[PDB]
Amino acid sequence: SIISVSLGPGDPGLITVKALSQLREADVIYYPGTVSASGAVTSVALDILKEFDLDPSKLRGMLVPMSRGAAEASYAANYASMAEEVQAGRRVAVVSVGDGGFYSTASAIIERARRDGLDCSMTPGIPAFIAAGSAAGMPLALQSDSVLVLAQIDEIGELERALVTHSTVVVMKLSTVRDELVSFLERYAKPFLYAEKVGMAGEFITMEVDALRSRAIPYFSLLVCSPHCRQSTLSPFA
Amino acid sequence: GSIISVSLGPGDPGLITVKALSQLREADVIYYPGTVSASGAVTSVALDILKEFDLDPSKLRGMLVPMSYAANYASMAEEVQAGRRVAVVSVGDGGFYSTASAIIERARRDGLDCSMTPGIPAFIAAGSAAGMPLALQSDSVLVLAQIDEIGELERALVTHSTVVVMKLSTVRDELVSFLERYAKPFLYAEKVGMAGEFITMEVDALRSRAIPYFSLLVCSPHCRQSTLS
Ligand SMILES: Nc1ncnc2c1ncn2[C@@H]1O[C@H](CSCC[C@H](N)C(=O)O)[C@@H](O)[C@H]1O
Ligand SMILES: Nc1ncnc2c1ncn2[C@@H]1O[C@H](CSCC[C@H](N)C(=O)O)[C@@H](O)[C@H]1O
Numbered sequence: 207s208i209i210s211v212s213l214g215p216g217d218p219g220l221i222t223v224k225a226l227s228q229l230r231e232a233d234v235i236y237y238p239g240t241v242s243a244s245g246a247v248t249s250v251a252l253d254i255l256k257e258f259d260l261d262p263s264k265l266r267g268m269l270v271p272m273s274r275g276a277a278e279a280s281y282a283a284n285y286a287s288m289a290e291e292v293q294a295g296r297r298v299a300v301v302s303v304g305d306g307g308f309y310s311t312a313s314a315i316i317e318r319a320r321r322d323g324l325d326c327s328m329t330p331g332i333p334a335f336i337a338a339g340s341a342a343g344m345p346l347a348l349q350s351d352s353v354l355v356l357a358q359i360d361e362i363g364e365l366e367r368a369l370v371t372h373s374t375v376v377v378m379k380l381s382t383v384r385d386e387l388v389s390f391l392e393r394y395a396k397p398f399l400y401a402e403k404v405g406m407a408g409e410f411i412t413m414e415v416d417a418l419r420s421r422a423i424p425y426f427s428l429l430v431c432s433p434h435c436r437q438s439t440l441s442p443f444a
Numbered sequence: 445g446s447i448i449s450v451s452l453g454p455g456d457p458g459l460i461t462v463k464a465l466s467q468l469r470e471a472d473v474i475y476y477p478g479t480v481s482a483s484g485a486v487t488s489v490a491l492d493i494l495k496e497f498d499l500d501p502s503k504l505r506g507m508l509v510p511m512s513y514a515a516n517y518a519s520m521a522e523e524v525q526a527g528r529r530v531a532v533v534s535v536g537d538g539g540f541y542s543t544a545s546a547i548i549e550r551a552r553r554d555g556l557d558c559s560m561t562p563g564i565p566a567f568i569a570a571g572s573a574a575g576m577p578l579a580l581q582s583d584s585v586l587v588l589a590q591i592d593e594i595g596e597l598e599r600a601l602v603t604h605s606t607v608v609v610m611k612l613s614t615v616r617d618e619l620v621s622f623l624e625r626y627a628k629p630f631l632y633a634e635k636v637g638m639a640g641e642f643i644t645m646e647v648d649a650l651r652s653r654a655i656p657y658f659s660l661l662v663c664s665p666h667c668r669q670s671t672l673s
Pocket of ligand 1: 302307308379401402403404425427428
């Protein structure tokens with residue numbers, strides 16, 4: 207069978223009991239990764255998997271890099287071998303950072319596993335934006351709030367318009383408006399959370415625009431704009 | 445001592461995080477939410493989850509509300525000052541329409557050591573249970589809760605393609621009327637991962653159906669990518 211196993215967003219302790227047992231029992235793994243102009247691999251998913259004491263030879267990397275991302279194609283070029291351990295009776299999981307049905311490319315493997323037969327399942331995980339809220343010690347939503355989550359916005363204008371109609375707004379992937387961010391956070395003169403590599407080795411979370419002026423805004427970062435940011439341990443309002 | 449907002453996840457005990465489980469097992473005292481109706485019957489899905497982890501039963505403290513209780517802060521203040529590890533639990537995630545949020549704010553409002561361990565929201569568990577994605581490359585996701593009238597949802601659905609609706613009890617009588625006129629893919633998800641889970645993408649399955657507090661609605665084109673469409 208093939209199982210879409212959510213890892214949670216970075217802290218290995220944030221994997222579910224179920225997802226962890228599913229990893230320990232899989233015959234082969236399948237994790238996404240990135241190469242950044244020369245080779246040498248970066249994989250936030252493998253960084254998590256490394257803490258579970260899994261057999262290193264079960265893990266199958268899925269690589270070509272950050273772009274579109276071309277991720278859709280990359281997974282597709284690996285499902286062929288996924289419908290082969292499966293026909294040979296083996297347990298295949300395909301891991302996702304955060305949750306496997308929340309902006310995950312794993313959603314191509316499962317949509318294709320169904321229609322093709324083959325016993326497939328999704329085990330859910332904690333979205334990054336959820337873990338970010340908790341890392342900052344704030345609520346994301348209270349009583350009747352709406353929450354809007356956006357991804358891959360094409361220019362900062364989009365965030366600005368959404369921000370008068372909605373309670374909380376969450377913006378993911380953020381190396382897309384990485385150059386517009388500080389100017390945006392200056393206008394909008396309102397509380398925000400910037401959260402990078404939540405639960406991972408290089409975690410960085412801030413509510414200070416000053417702290418972002420010279421910061422490189424990488425793929426694994428998100429923004430929360432919400433009056434609830436005033437409740438964070440990171441806010442002067444306490 | 446200290447106080448921790450521990451998220452339980454949304455119902456299936458296997459969906460608690462390893463960390464949250466560790467923290468419950470180490471807690472001296474665990475406070476959990478529940479409701480008591482006009483008749484005196486108690487409902488507590490948090491305790492239903494808790495009863496799946498082999499915790500010492502004597503350490504569990506109910507905080508029962510009609511259906512104000514943010515007042516339970518003594519005994520918690522009481523316990524922490526005393527040196528004890530207090531846990532306050534939430535179904536799903538504790539910062540996502542959770543009333544643990546009230547306790548934590550009050551807790552830090554005093555000197556107290558507080559932290560939040562996240563959990564999986566029920567809308568997330570629902571998409572996974574149905575075998576469908578909630579979001580792909582560039583989609584927006586809109587979550588509404590306790591909408592004041594059904595118009596809210598219609599208005600949202602024209603300008604947003606994936607809309608989740610949560611405390612649906614405010615709008616329960618209007619649901620089937622709405623779905624026949626929407627005439628598009630949807631997921632109804634009730635008590636996901638709990639005894640009596642019921643998941644449907646069929647309007648006929650909702651006609652004789654009583655729609656309770658722990659249900660949510662996902663309206664998304666992506667519901668067609670499920671097994672149950
Ligand atoms: N640990 C983390 N910290 C900050 N952002 C993260 C993150 N993990 C994932 N993200 C966000 O997720 C985007 C990739 S889309 C994948 C989302 C993941 N499936 C989830 O459930 O959250 C990144 O651009 C970033 O905005
Ligand atoms: N197991 C479950 N199944 C279906 N709906 C659930 C659920 N748990 C919570 N809900 C939804 O959550 C609403 C309560 S507000 C609590 C939300 C919880 N903190 C979370 O993170 O999901 C309910 O009205 C219902 O819409």
